[PDB]
Amino acid sequence: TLSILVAHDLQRVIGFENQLPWHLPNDLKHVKKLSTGHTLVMGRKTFESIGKPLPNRRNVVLTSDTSFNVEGVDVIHSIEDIYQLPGHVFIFGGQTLYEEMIDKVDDMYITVIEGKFRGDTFFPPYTFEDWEVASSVEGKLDEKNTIPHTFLHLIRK
Ligand SMILES: NC(=O)c1ccc[n+]([C@@H]2O[C@H](COP(=O)([O-])OP(=O)(O)OC[C@H]3O[C@@H](n4cnc5c(N)ncnc54)[C@H](OP(=O)(O)O)[C@@H]3O)[C@@H](O)[C@H]2O)c1
Numbered sequence: 435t436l437s438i439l440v441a442h443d444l445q446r447v448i449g450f451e452n453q454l455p456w457h458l459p460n461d462l463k464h465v466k467k468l469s470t471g472h473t474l475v476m477g478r479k480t481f482e483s484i485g486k487p488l489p490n491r492r493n494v495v496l497t498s499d500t501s502f503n504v505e506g507v508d509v510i511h512s513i514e515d516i517y518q519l520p521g522h523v524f525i526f527g528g529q530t531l532y533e534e535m536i537d538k539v540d541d542m543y544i545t546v547i548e549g550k551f552r553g554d555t556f557f558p559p560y561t562f563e564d565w566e567v568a569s570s571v572e573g574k575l576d577e578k579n580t581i582p583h584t585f586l587h588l589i590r591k
């Protein structure tokens with residue numbers, strides 16, 4: 435299974451200055467639950483922003499850098515390498531990976547951040563006429579999670 439995993443705002447902002455524009459612990463938990471025990475594929479910039487591989491899952495980084503060799507991280511140098519990865523693979527950003535993979539993935543796990551943030555990187559436009567809403571769940575708000583958000587699972591029609 436090949437899935438997109440992404441949080442984007444009302445205008446499809448996903449990032450600003452190589453970081454997430456929002457602070458939303460519940461979505462990090464969401465990511466943790468979906469991807470633990472499986473595989474995350476991310477572009478080089480996304481990886482460097484995180485700084486270290488995420489625990490308890492396979493971390494795969496796409497880069498043209500032949501010198502890239504980080505402990506706890508597998509490297510790939512081509513999009514086509516993704517298709518050789520076994521198991522449930524999540525395309526985990528950033529903008530370049532999403533643009534390169536959105537027409538190839540089976541489904542998308544999207545957290546819609548229900549606000550308008552300043553961004554410099556975007557999720558590509560998509561239409562619900564191409565995607566069935568398998569599920570849509572409002573995120574619960576609290577003291578630590580104050581931005582409204584919705585968890586979508588979309589499956590390609
Ligand atoms: N909101 C979210 O769910 C979410 C999730 C992930 C990331 N983000 C955000 O996304 C932003 C980063 O996105 P970005 O587009 O700037 O960078 P990115 O996609 O994370 O990384 C781009 C790099 O990936 C490598 N790459 C991509 N395609 C390749 C290919 N076909 N062959 C070889 N290498 C390839 C290249 O690395 P080299 O230059 O080293 O060759 C390229 O420079 C950040 O702001 C981050 O916070 C948001």
Ligand SMILES: CCc1nc(N)nc(N)c1C#CCc1cc(-c2ccc(C(=O)O)cc2)ccc1OC
Binds near residue numbers: 439454461465543544
């Ligand atoms: C966690 C935000 C997010 N949500 C959803 N639904 N899909 C994604 N692909 C990402 C993402 C991402 C990349 C990223 C993750 C993190 C991050 C931080 C903490 C945790 C964690 O505590 O589990 C996970 C990812 C930090 C920075 C960062 O890019 C700047």
